[PDB]
Write a protein that binds this ligand. Structure first.
Ligand SMILES: [Ca+2]
Ligand SMILES: [Ca+2]
Length: 172
C-alpha cells in the first residue's frame, strides 16, 4: 500500500494474462496482451451470431467497496466501430451456493482512448434471469461481490483494447 489518494488499482496488464475468455455455438473469441494506454494493455477479438455468445471474466481478491467508491477503466476500439457490450456483476449468495443477485450495464467504445468512470448507480437487475441461492434485495451490495464479467450485448463482430482498471474516490 502507498499513503495517498483512495484510488485502488485492480488490473493494468503489466504481467501475464489473468482473465477467463469464452464463446460458443457459432460465436467466437480471440484474446492476448498488447501495448496499452500505460505500458501494457489487453486486446480482445469477437465474432457474433443471433443466438451465440462471447465474454471474459475477472476474479477479485477483495469485494467490498461501498460508502463512496466509483469504478474507472480506459478503453479504445481497434475495429474503429462503436460495438455494444455489457458488464455483468455477480453478488454473493446468502446460502453459499452459486451467486446471490445478477446486475447489468451496457456501454460503447470510440476510435481513440476514453476514461469510462461509472458510480455503480447506473446498473439494473437482469430481468428474465436471476440465481436460486438469492438475496433478491434490489440493491447492488458493494459489501459482498462474487465476480465480474464482460459480455456480448449485440450479434455483430468487433475488436477492442482495455487498460487502467481501478476504483476511484476523493474530495477534488
Ligand atoms: Ca497498463
Ligand atoms: Ca443484493
Amino acid at each position: 500500500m502507498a499513503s495517498a489518494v483512495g484510488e485502488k488499482m485492480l488490473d493494468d496488464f503489466e504481467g501475464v494474462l489473468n482473465w477467463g475468455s469464452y464463446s460458443g455455438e457459432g460465436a467466437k473469441v480471440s484474446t492476448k496482451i498488447v501495448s496499452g494506454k500505460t505500458g501494457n494493455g489487453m486486446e480482445v477479438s469477437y465474432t457474433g451470431t443471433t443466438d451465440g455468445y462471447w465474454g471474459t471474466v475477472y476474479s477479485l481478491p477483495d469485494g467490498d467497496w461501498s460508502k463512496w467508491l466509483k469504478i474507472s477503466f480506459d478503453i479504445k476500439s481497434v475495429d474503429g466501430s462503436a460495438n455494444e457490450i455489457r458488464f455483468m456483476i455477480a453478488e454473493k449468495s446468502i446460502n453459499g451456493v452459486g451467486d446471490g443477485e445478477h446486475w447489468v450495464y451496457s456501454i460503447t467504445p470510440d476510435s481513440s482512448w476514453k476514461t469510462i468512470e461509472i458510480p455503480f448507480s447506473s446498473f439494473r437487475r437482469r430481468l428474465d434471469y436471476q440465481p436460486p441461492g438469492q438475496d433478491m434485495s434490489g440493491t447492488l451490495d458493494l459489501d459482498n461481490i462474487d465476480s465480474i464479467h464482460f459480455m456480448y450485448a449485440n450479434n455483430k463482430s468487433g475488436k477492442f483494447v482495455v487498460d487502467n482498471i481501478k476504483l476511484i474516490g476523493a474530495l477534488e
